[PDB]
Structures are given as C-alpha cells and as structure tokens.
Amino acid sequence: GHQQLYWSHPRKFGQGSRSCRVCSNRHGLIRKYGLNMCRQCFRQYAKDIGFIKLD
Amino acid sequence: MLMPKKNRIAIYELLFKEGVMVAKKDVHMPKHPELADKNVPNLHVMKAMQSLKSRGYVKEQFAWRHFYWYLTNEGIQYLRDYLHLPPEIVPATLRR
Amino acid sequence: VNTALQEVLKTALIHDGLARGIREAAKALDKRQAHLCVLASNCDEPMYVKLVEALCAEHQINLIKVDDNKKLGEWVGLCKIDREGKPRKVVGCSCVVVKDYGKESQAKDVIEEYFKC
Amino acid sequence: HRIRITLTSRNVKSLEKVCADLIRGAKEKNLKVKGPVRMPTKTLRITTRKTPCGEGSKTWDRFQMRIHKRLIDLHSPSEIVKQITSISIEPGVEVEVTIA
Amino acid sequence: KSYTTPKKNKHKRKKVKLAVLKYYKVDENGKISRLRRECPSDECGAGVFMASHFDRHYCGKCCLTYCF
Numbered sequence: 001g002h003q004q005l006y007w008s009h010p011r012k013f014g015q016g017s018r019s020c021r022v023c024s025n026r027h028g029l030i031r032k033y034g035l036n037m038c039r040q041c042f043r044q045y046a047k048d049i050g051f052i053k054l055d
Numbered sequence: 056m057l058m059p060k061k062n063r064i065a066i067y068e069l070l071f072k073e074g075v076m077v078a079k080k081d082v083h084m085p086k087h088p089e090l091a092d093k094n095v096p097n098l099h100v101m102k103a104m105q106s107l108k109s110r111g112y113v114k115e116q117f118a119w120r121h122f123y124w125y126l127t128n129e130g131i132q133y134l135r136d137y138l139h140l141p142p143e144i145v146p147a148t149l150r151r
Numbered sequence: 152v153n154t155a156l157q158e159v160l161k162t163a164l165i166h167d168g169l170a171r172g173i174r175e176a177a178k179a180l181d182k183r184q185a186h187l188c189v190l191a192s193n194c195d196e197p198m199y200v201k202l203v204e205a206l207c208a209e210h211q212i213n214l215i216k217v218d219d220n221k222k223l224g225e226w227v228g229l230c231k232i233d234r235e236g237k238p239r240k241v242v243g244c245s246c247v248v249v250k251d252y253g254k255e256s257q258a259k260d261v262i263e264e265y266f267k268c
Numbered sequence: 269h270r271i272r273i274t275l276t277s278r279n280v281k282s283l284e285k286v287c288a289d290l291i292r293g294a295k296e297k298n299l300k301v302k303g304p305v306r307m308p309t310k311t312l313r314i315t316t317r318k319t320p321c322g323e324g325s326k327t328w329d330r331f332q333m334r335i336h337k338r339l340i341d342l343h344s345p346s347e348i349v350k351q352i353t354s355i356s357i358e359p360g361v362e363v364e365v366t367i368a
Numbered sequence: 369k370s371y372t373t374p375k376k377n378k379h380k381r382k383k384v385k386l387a388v389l390k391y392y393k394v395d396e397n398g399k400i401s402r403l404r405r406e407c408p409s410d411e412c413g414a415g416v417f418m419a420s421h422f423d424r425h426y427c428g429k430c431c432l433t434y435c436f
C-alpha cells in the first residue's frame with residue numbers, strides 16, 4: 001500500500017529532495033553557499049543579512 | 056482517526072512538560088526531529104493538532120515550514136480532562 | 152460495598168490498566184493476568200451461561216454477579232455521548248476483565264476479603 | 269607559547285578598530301606581541317535577475333559580501349589572551365582562538 | 369464524480385456474531401478446550417490464535433504461512 005509506497009521514488013537527488021527554503025518552490029533555486037533559496041525571496045530578504053550594494 | 060492510541064497519548068505526555076512544539080510540513084516523512092526515542096508519525100501529529108485547532112482547543116500559525124501551537128487554560132483543561140491528571144499541577148511554562 | 156466496586160472500576164478506568172471488552176479480556180486470560188471480573192445471570196444468553204461459568208470457575212477469577220449485563224457497560228462508559236448527564240443512546244456489553252496495576256485502594260482490602268471470604 | 273587569534277567579522281571598520289584597540293591593550297599590559305598580519309578580503313558575487321515575468325529588458329543586479337579577516341601572533345600565556353578576548357564584545361564580530 | 373466503471377470497494381469485515389464459541393469450545397463438562405491452531409512464534413500473543421484455512425494456516429502479525 002501507500003505505507004510502503006511513500007518511498008517508491010528515492011528522494012536523494014534532483015529537485016524533489018532540493019526544494020526551496022521559503023514556500024517549497026521548485027524553480028529558480030540558489031544552492032550556492034548553502035542557501036537552497038529561490039532568487040526572488042533572496043532579493044526580498046537579502047538586505048537585512050548585513051548587506052549593502054557597492055558595485 | 057488512523058493513529059495508534061499509545062502514540063497519541065505519548066504526544067500529549069510530551070505536551071505536558073512544555074506548552075509548544077515544532078513540526079515541519081511534509082507528507083512523505085515518518086521521522087520526528089523533536090521526539091526521537093520512539094517511532095511516531097508526525098504527519099498524523101500535525102493532523103491531530105489541526106483537528107484540535109478546528110475544534111478550538113489550541114491556536115496555530117505559520118512560519119515557512121512549521122506550525123506553532125500555544126496551549127491556553129482551556130487547552131490544559133482538556134489535557135487534564137483527557138489523560139486524567141490532577142488539576143493542582145500545572146505545566147512548566149509558568150515556573151518563573 | 153457496591154459503591155466501593157464502582158469507585159474501584161472508575162479508578163481502573165482512570166489509570167487505564169483494564170481490558171475493555173470480551174476478546175481483549177480473553178487475551179488477558181491467555182496472557183495469565185486474570186484477577187477479577189463481573190458476571191451476571193438471567194440475561195439474554197441462550198447457552199452462554201455454561202461457557203461463562205466454565206471460564207470463570209477455572210483459575211483464580213473473582214465471583215462477582217449483577218442482575219443484568221445491560222448496566223455492566225454503564226460502569227465501563229462505552230459510548231457515553233453527553234457525559235454531563237444521561238446519554239441519548241447507549242449500547243451494551245458483556246464482561247470486562249480488569250488488570251489493575253496498583254492494588255492498594257481505600258476499599259481494595261475489603262473487596263479482596265469479599266472475594267476470598 | 270605563541271597564541272593565534274583568528275579574528276573574523278562582517279565589516280572592515282569594526283575589525284580594524286577591534287584590532288587597533290587590542291594592539292593598544294597588548295602594548296599597555298606590558299607583553300610581547302608581533303605586528304598586525306593583514307589577510308586579503310573575500311569578495312563574494314551574486315548575479316540574479318530582477319524580472320518576475322519573462323518580458324521586459326533583461327536587467328541584472330549584483331550583490332557583494334565584503335568580509336575581512338585579521339590574525340596576530342602572541343608570546344603571552346593563554347590566560348591573558350582569554351581575559352582580553354572575553355571582554356568588550358560587539359555584534360558583527362565572530363572570534364576564534366586557536367592554541368599553538 | 370461518478371465513473372462509468374463500478375466502484376471497487378474495500379474489504380469490509382463481516383459481523384461474525386457470537387464467535388466466542390469459536391474460541392473456547394465447551395465439552396460435555398465445564399472445561400477449557402482449544403481447537404484452532406495457535407501461532408508458534410512468540411511475537412504474537414497466546415490469545416491471538418493463528419487463522420485456520422481449509423488446507424493450511426495463516427499467521428496474523430508474523431505472516432508465517434505454513435503448509436502440510
């Protein structure tokens with residue numbers, strides 16, 4: 001049944017195991033420096049992490 | 056509800072010592088990060104707390120993965136009416 | 152003494168050591184924790200009286216009898232919707248075998264005395 | 269018994285100020301200490317799009333992390349280093365003490 | 369809502385009324401007796417009798433089905 005078929009697909013790789021950190025989005029991910037974050041909410045909450053824009 | 060009886064009672068036994076617990080939102084994971092000494096389905100746990108919120112015994116709010124439930128006076132009253140503890144004792148959220 | 156039996160059954164329901172029902176009670180006897188249970192007579196039993204006397208008067212089981220089994224489940228609390236008063240719809244039961252963990256109550260000594268003598 | 273203090277922070281002005289006042293305190297407390305060894309900064313690049321939809325001019329914005337690090341060489345025992353490190357802390361600086 | 373294929377229902381358990389005589393067999397005199405095969409494994413309880421089929425037996429929790 002579904003109790004033993006919950007793990008029919010191994011979620012060890014791909015977009016299924018690597019979802020977004022904000023609202024579980026599956027597009028536009030940033031895996032760089034351990035964010036696992038979508039780009040738009042990174043832009044939304046990237047000013048209060050101790051950041052000022054220079055270039 | 057499709058959960059074992061001893062697991063549910065152990066969940067409110069965990070909630071006796073505290074006034075809140077964390078739980079991630081996922082429908083394909085059987086493991087609990089907070090409670091690790093025994094097997095418990097956290098899917099059924101968050102279903103139990105959303106049923107408790109539906110009948111109006113506890114609150115619930117969202118922050119990006121996790122639901123947060125705050126026990127009130129009627130919540131601990133239903134706790135001591137359900138698992139049948141003496142009303143003199145209180146949870147440890149008031150020990151200041 | 153019936154008030155003491157009601158208090159002991161209710162306290163067993165508080166402590167949750169009893170096996171509510173017939174089949175789980177049969178599991179309890181097959182696991183050998185048969186100590187006390189309440190029987191009855193002149194019920195709606197066609198042949199069940201011989202079977203219940205055979206399972207009762209076999210090995211260290213108390214001899215407690217009531218008038219009928221329709222009020223035996225009232226002490227257990229089967230389906231008591233609206234528990235603050237008389238429930239609107241109640242179903243019946245036959246027997247409940249109790250496995251009480253702490254056998255020191257206020258009147259458990261005189262109840263065990265009534266069992267023994 | 270040389271002691272190395274890996275001093276890391278988020279800003280450069282706070283890091284240089286903390287290094288300067290710790291050098292002044294080490295000079296005032298009558299101990300031997302080496303010169304300030306300066307390490308290069310880490311410039312950390314982020315290139316993302318700005319348009320939520322697929323229309324419009326393709327515009328980009330660049331995000332930069334400007335973090336520095338400083339390290340010094342001691343000759344004092346570790347108790348003096350501990351009592352000058354565990355006092356006068358500020359938010360934005362993460363300290364690291366490594367014995368040698 | 370309703371498919372043209374008929375509904376494939378789940379196995380509803382039949383109401384086997386007065387099955388206690390299927391557990392404790394009453395002899396000519398009042399005595400405990402057993403007729404069904406019990407599960408040899410200690411994982412299942414002693415009251416949990418192993419199921420009796422027409423030609424073999426089926427275990428409940430252990431699922432160790434043996435044949436003659």
Ligand SMILES: [Zn+2]
Pocket residue numbers: 407408409411412427428429430431432
């Ligand atoms: Zn078995």
